[PDB]
Design a protein around this ligand. Structure first.
Ligand SMILES: [Ca+2]
Ligand SMILES: [Ca+2]
Ligand SMILES: [Ca+2]
Lengths: 244, 245
């Protein structure tokens, strides 16, 4: 069940941004959004895929455990922040693509396909290269599907050990306060091409008081300078809801 | 493992007219540093820092259902208005909801509680003085050094408990999160104490920065609640000058 909320498009139009925000309280059974159509529209997950990839890496033994260190071989990487040894949380937080590309290669297509089916992850299409399907491939997932996926993770209901889900959940904490904890992951596919904008994401959940809120936000983007909006718009909306 | 004294840290202590100790250990080198080797080994009431092992014991014995259990408020007034509400495990640890943990301690029982503190090698392992207050006003005592050893075991999931339960308690202890580091910690406060017998204030935890991990334990004598904030500001100042957080 998805209900549209008009008091949210104000944050979007004010920034001339085409996007959607999905917020669900207690569970993914009842969610609110600014655009019913876009809430379920599927987009390339980009780095938000690091969440299922981390779980699958742990489940398959590819990632030995939570204390696994991902050694930098000294070879140049796309971002300087990636050129260094990294822990799992570290690789997730700085969005170290090469680390996850290697995890993907070791997981292999058969196991990758198998897990995306068990996780009901978007269109489950991993074609185009085992180390880049979530970056430039055909994999697509919606904001609503993202929330359902995160809820299962929160509840330890994904097909994986609770241990491994707990490990990934801690690696996703991005904000801690006395009253609440925020688990999230950002994503950016790029600026896209003419007539075909890229997508920017921010998904996760908020554990406030004894309640829990699952959210997923994405927007069309053709200029990296607009990136900050993937967090500001959603944060503003959740602030007006007294969630954070 | 090793420990070295660095009296230069006393700087932050004098500037605030505080008598206390800070123990900071680097996991990779397994070496620790402290402003005072003597106080580092002195044992004090763990106070609310005991909620860490207590929470672990609660999950292990089944007293605590799971990470999602909600501790409902019975409505009966409590020592602090902050505790008068329904709380999650994390919520109860963050606000130090004593009543919540006294209930847990009671359900656990002396025999089992004693067993786990033995397995955990927790301080003096003395729980006499009331199963529901031995860590608040009882005879239980633990040093700053023992605290970091305990926390390292928890970090490495090496405590005599399921990894799942240690993981649950570990996320409950998250107090600060940044792209470059994650801080796990728990404060402690016994009271203002008496004449020539001040209370004790604690701040223990660990920092996961880059691929290094820093375990810390801090305590100080306290006679006035106004100085309470010092339990965090002093250690924070030290770890900042060390470029840790
Ligand atoms: Ca959590
Ligand atoms: Ca990004
Ligand atoms: Ca941690």
């Amino acid at each position: 069940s998805i209900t549209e909320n008009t008091s949210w498009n104000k944050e979007f139009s004010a920034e001339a941004v085409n996007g959607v925000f999905v917020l669900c309280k207690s569970s993914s059974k009842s969610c609110a959004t600014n655009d019913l159509a876009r809430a379920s529209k599927e987009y390339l997950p980009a780095s938000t895929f690091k969440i299922p990839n981390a779980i699958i890496g742990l489940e398959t033994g590819v990632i030995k455990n939570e204390h696994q260190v991902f050694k930098w071989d000294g070879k140049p990487r796309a971002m300087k922040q990636w050129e260094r040894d990294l822990t799992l949380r570290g690789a997730i937080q700085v969005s170290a693509v090469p680390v996850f590309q290697q995890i993907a290669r070791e997981v292999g297509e058969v196991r990758m396909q198998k897990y995306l089916k068990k996780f009901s992850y978007g269109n489950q299409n991993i074609s185009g290269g085992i180390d880049k399907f979530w970056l430039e491939g055909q994999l697509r997932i919606s904001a609503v599907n993202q929330v359902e996926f995160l809820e299962s993770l929160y509840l330890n209901k994904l097909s994986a050990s609770k241990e491994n889900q707990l490990i990934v959940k801690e690696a996703l904490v991005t904000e801690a306060a006395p009253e609440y904890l925020v688990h999230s992951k950002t994503g950016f596919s790029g600026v896209g091409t003419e007539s075909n904008p890229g997508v920017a994401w921010w998904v996760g959940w908020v554990e406030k008081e004894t309640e829990v809120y699952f959210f997923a936000f994405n927007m069309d983007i053709d200029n990296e300078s607009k990136l900050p909006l993937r967090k500001s718009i959603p944060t503003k909306i959740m602030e007006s809801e007294g969630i954070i």
